[PDB]
Amino acid sequence: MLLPWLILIPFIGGFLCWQTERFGVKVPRWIALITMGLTLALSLQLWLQGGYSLTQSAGIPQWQSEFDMPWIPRFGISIHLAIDGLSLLMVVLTGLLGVLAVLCSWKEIEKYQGFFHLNLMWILGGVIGVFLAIDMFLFFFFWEMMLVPMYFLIALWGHKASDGKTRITAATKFFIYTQASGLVMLIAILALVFVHYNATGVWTFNYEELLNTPMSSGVEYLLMLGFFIAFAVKMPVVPLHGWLPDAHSQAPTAGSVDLAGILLKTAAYGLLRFSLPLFPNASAEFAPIAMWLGVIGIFYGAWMAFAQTDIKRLIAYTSVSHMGFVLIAIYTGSQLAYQGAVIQMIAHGLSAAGLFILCGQLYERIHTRDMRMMGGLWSKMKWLPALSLFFAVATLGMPGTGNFVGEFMILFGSFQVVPVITVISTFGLVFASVYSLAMLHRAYFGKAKSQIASQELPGMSLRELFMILLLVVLLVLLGFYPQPILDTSHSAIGNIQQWFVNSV
Amino acid sequence: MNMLALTIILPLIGFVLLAFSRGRWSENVSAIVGVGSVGLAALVTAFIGVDFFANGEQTYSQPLWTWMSVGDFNIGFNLVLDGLSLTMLSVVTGVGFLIHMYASWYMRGEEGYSRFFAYTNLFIASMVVLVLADNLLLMYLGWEGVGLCSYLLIGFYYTDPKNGAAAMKAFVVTRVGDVFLAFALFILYNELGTLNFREMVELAPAHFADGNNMLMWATLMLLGGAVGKSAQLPLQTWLADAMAGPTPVSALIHAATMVTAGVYLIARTHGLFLMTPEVLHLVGIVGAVTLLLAGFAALVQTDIKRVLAYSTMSQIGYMFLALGVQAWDAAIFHLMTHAFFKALLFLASGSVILACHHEQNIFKMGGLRKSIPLVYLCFLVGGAALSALPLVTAGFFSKDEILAGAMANGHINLMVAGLVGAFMTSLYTFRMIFIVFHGSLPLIVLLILSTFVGALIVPPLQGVLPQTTELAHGSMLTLEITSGVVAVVGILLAAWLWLKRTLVTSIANSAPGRLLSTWWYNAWGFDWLYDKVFVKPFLGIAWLLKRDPLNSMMNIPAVLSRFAGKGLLLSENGYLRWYVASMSIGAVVVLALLMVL
């Protein structure tokens, strides 16, 4: 009932951010903060009234909330929203990251700032719509309509130091990757709908009815592969990753775009919600390939992160390695590893948000991303090197931060399932420590390697400092007390796990 | 007595306050906050020990919350205290308090005073969590904390790139050890379903009645973590190269917290190690080999701090040997006494470094007894405890119990390795002492504690650790006699060579002698071996991959599309006759295709 308004509030807020552009230049940032805070507080309200900790696994489907309104009745297509514990954690994460994105672009006083806010809330509403939709066509519709605002702001609002051709190239690469993979997912969706219509005789795009689809072994594999190609472009899974560092490097300078579009992990949610319950046998046969792709992602992303001279590319490849861990977790079929993957998704969102915000601030003060032109920055800045030290410490998976809870719970469940992959992944944790310390030494330690690094730099503003400290506090609380998050997503994870292991 | 959480929280409060102070407070205020938090932890430890002895030495449990609860995966945030935890907590808090006082005197006028004390307070907090945890995951939290704090404190003078390189090396080597420890944790949860130490010991014999392979794997990985943190074979290079940091950092790492963590981990998990006797004898072998290599390296070192580092490695090898021969009480007693005299030796070395006001070589020094006699006396008593001077110092008694435990169990190779290691310790210790010296309330406190007064302290390990098998009184008498004779022979012989230097220069110039001296100066080539097999291939693969080959191979279809479009656009030449010709060609193709089906 309140989920249609969950998708509609960001859209109307961005529309009004564009509409009241005439009343001022610093007007639409307050409207942006108001609508993102409204979405966040509404999500917190539905969390507090959800009662997910007192919910038992009663099979699939099992939603806290659901809503259906017929949109294209010719194909049996309806706006069908639903919410349970995992999707609620994802939308609360989306609201928090959207609030941080609005707070991140606060000082961007431009003529067309209202349109940038409109694009940002179209992105956030699209991510929320992917997290809430349970109609397959409608889910794919949100999956692909997140693309156009993200393309336009990467191409037009992106990294100003680089030429416009580089930003346009990065935006086009990202759009082509994700839209081609989305079209493959649409092909899989259409084939599944037609197979069910041939089996029964009724048109439906409802996820709850497509679950009981009798398919031969091999057709289910192809449908799973189309879904996985979409979810692997967006995950990112190697070798479908390079759009991610080129899009992060050509993202807008403030860092809001990294938070709004990329650092929300809709592909892991899609694999948990759609790839495993619709095609459980095919996912079971596909599991070793996905696990070895995850291992390759971990080590390749670590080696790529060590090789960078740009900080933003280093953080992007760090994200690639962490999502390799998550990809190993999702295909284990283990409840402990699934819960660890949920914790890892949330902790990766918070920690990479902190890293990208700090990198954007550092670029604001030193006007370069090149790590050979900076050094000894611990003696020049007041807050930035120590908070960067905290987020790089959380990045390598230090206990006391939520990343450790996620990674080690993933590794506990995976060692219960796949021991050798777990051993190789823990040596990947050693690699994570190596690249985090390399970034810390190249940026903030040693002597100044240029003229801008030899100068005292201004301290951070109170808004950026307070949002960074909020991320720090949330990461520490996740590391020391992850139990509310686990109790929130226990029922949905349990139902997905039971459907996955009771069908193979 | 429920103030174990206080002993965790107080150094945490000190770290948080001094970190958010960011150097703005005065030096006196920063010293008060850091040293007062560590001293308050020590005082709460003292009261906890008093009440622990008042209640008949009973194990106490203080749960706080449930850290993780996912089905059968139940990890609690609970502390436990027994005699071993009390001994480690007392050693950590007291020696850390003395080092904090000396660092408060020593770091005057330095940059990052409050940052230094915040890092040391987080170090103390992490080690208190390490020694007080009742399960392996909370102990892993403390393990990673002490690793991170050691990285932060070794590279304290961050402007010098050598300091940062040493800190990064220490962190990476310790993290390898922690990955081995993580393997042990995964094995133990997968097998026993719990990570609580008492519960694992209770459930291991029933679960492993048929197959003992996974328990042997878990204990081997526990030893891997232990040698990772205690700087033993094959992860010992970081202690050699961690001299880049300041002197109280070295005292904290070598005496109070860092190197004792592996010994504590082996002692705490002694039930699992006793269920796998081959792994326990492997612990003893690792300790014996490590102390042999450390002594042979310590004789040929050139700086005071490197000699002290390799002496620390040698005595940690002694403790590992004592654990391997089931002399648990001797191992913990030697841990306390070595904490005392090694902290004292590092404090005196820092004093002589301040007196020389430079990182001067030891071969230039000589005749400093007429200028700084108190530092000479501190170095002499610390070396006498190091070299086991009989009936004067506590280190002699601790090594005597270690050797008695080695004798009473029936291990001859470990016994002779310990004897020649005591000989080697005497030679390198008095080599350093007579090369440098010929040719202060904490200082008094650990000078007193480096005598038999420190030997009077008995660790209360009756209920937690098993008692060592009693050697015969005659055999004990001959072992004490031969230990004293070996120590005195080493002292007198090293004083004979290193009082002019004539016989030493014979092997110090011969080609096999130069080869052996340079081989033992390079940590037996382990740094070179690790550079060749780990670091250089890592840099090579990173340089090979720096251009992102997978991105290019996925960019290949865009190149193919551009080439195909450029090729197809050549047919749009604008000639009407070619357009008619292409229409007729397409007509031919369509007609032929329709005819062939």
Ligand SMILES: CCCCCCCCCCCCCCCCCC(=O)OC[C@H](COP(=O)(O)OCCN)OC(=O)CCCCCCCCCCCCCCCCC
């Ligand atoms: C200019 C650039 C563009 C042009 C050049 C590049 C090429 C573009 C085209 C590429 C795709 C080609 C077609 C791929 C699908 C082939 C389908 C097929 O052959 O299916 C056969 C069979 C069908 O199932 P069947 O067994 O008949 O079921 C009835 C009884 N069971 O199928 C099965 O039984 C299952 C077969 C599964 C394996 C075949 C599909 C491989 C897909 C490879 C990509 C994804 C790999 C995994 C993910 C990697 C990391 C993201």
Ligand SMILES: CCCCCCCCCCCCCCCCCC(=O)OC[C@H](COP(=O)(O)OCCN)OC(=O)CCCCCCCCCCCCCCCCC
């Ligand atoms: C380059 C980008 C685009 C990707 C390539 C384009 C799509 C390639 C799809 C290849 C499909 C190969 C199918 C081979 C068999 C076809 C004839 C046949 O025997 O069909 C069997 C069956 C009809 O018999 P029926 O009684 O209806 O069976 C019900 C059980 N499903 O048939 C059915 O029931 C329907 C079978 C549908 C199979 C799924 C089709 C879509 C799968 C997702 C996309 C392709 C795979 C992922 C991408 C590959 C790499 C690019």
Ligand SMILES: CCCCCCCCCCCCCCCCCC(=O)OC[C@H](COP(=O)(O)OCCN)OC(=O)CCCCCCCCCCCCCCCCC
């Ligand atoms: C738990 C018991 C022990 C068990 C093991 C635990 C190990 C894991 C611990 C994880 C936490 C991160 C550890 C590393 C943090 C390093 C921060 C740092 O360097 O602080 C020092 C720095 C002051 O240094 P200084 O040079 O004087 O000032 C810079 C400018 N002049 O400080 C500053 O510049 C300002 C402070 C920067 C950030 C400090 C740390 C923040 C994270 C911890 C607290 C988070 C909030 C806790 C409360 C949450 C709500 C209840």
Ligand SMILES: CCCCCCCCCCCCCCCCCC(=O)OC[C@H](COP(=O)(O)OCCN)OC(=O)CCCCCCCCCCCCCCCCC
């Ligand atoms: C090794 C770490 C040791 C612990 C100290 C520091 C931990 C990190 C501090 C920030 C995060 C705290 C997260 C945990 C808070 C308590 C969670 C909880 O469940 O509390 C409830 C518990 C009483 O309920 P109980 O019945 O035990 O629970 C069973 C199911 N409800 O409540 C209790 O039992 C009361 C617990 C009180 C704890 C007070 C801690 C004060 C810490 C001050 C310094 C903070 C330093 C933060 C940074 C550390 C390094 C990153």
